Design a protein around this ligand. Structure first.
Ligand SMILES: [Fe+3]
Length: 45
């Protein structure tokens, strides 16, 4: 499943590590757990 990386801090969201919850299901108020930016500052990776 499509992984995304934080442009600012390099954190990588891998659905497989979160019970197969895809990036597109995360809430509008979700932010990077390392640096706090919103989903719009992530890139497919
Ligand atoms: Fe980040």
């Amino acid at each position: 499943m499509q992984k995304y990386v934080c442009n600012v801090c390099g954190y990588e969201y891998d659905p497989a590590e979160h019970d197969n919850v895809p990036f597109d299901q995360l809430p509008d108020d979700w932010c990077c757990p390392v640096c706090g930016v919103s989903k719009d500052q992530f890139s497919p990776a």
